């Protein structure tokens, strides 16, 4: 299992735009693609993202480039980012691939907001971390996927993934 696959299964795959849980115009692999209602502004950040006149559907090549850049942002963001980073270094290479699905999610802004559990996470309390982030709207809104992320943050395995 890497990120990937592991991302994969956490968001699914559709090739046609489609509302978030969150009821936000999103189309590939969990591509965030506009906060707003419209679904012609939705059409067109697609095709400017896209490079080409899309008509709301994309071919799966794309939706993996997509999601490629995706991926690399994310993890440079944390790099970045002063409060991700330290985290990130800390932590073995399963825990990576957790944080780095939590920032696809919810955003480095999101994530550095989570500062009790960053700490936790820090010094490797690994049953206390997992406790404290279950306390979040996020847990809340998308238990499944939350008790996922919560489970490899706790075992630093990929067993809730298999
Ligand atoms: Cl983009
Ligand atoms: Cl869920």
């Known amino acids: 299992m890497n990120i990937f696959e592991m991302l994969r299964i956490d968001e699914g795959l559709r090739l046609k735009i489609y509302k978030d849980t969150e009821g936000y115009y999103t189309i590939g692999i969990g591509h965030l693609?506009?906060?707003?209602?419209?679904?012609?502004?939705?059409?067109?950040?697609?095709?400017?993202?896209?490079?080409?006149?899309?008509?709301?559907?994309?071919?799966?090549?794309?939706?993996?480039?997509?999601?490629?850049?995706?991926?690399?942002?994310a993890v440079r963001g944390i790099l970045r980012n002063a409060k991700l980073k330290p985290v990130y270094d800390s932590l073995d290479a399963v825990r990576r691939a957790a944080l780095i699905n939590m920032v696809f999610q919810m955003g480095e802004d999101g994530v550095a907001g989570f500062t009790n559990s960053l700490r936790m996470l820090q010094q490797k309390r690994w049953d206390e971390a997992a406790v404290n982030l279950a306390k979040s709207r996020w847990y809340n809104q998308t238990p499944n996927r939350a008790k996922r992320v919560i489970t490899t943050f706790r075992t630093g395995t990929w067993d809730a993934y298999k």
């Not at 012609?40 to 799966?60: C, F, M, Q, Y």
């Open 33 to 73: 693609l506009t906060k707003s209602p419209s679904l012609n502004a939705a059409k067109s950040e697609l095709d400017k993202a896209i490079g080409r006149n899309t008509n709301g559907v994309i071919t799966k090549d794309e939706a993996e480039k997509l999601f490629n850049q995706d991926v690399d942002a």
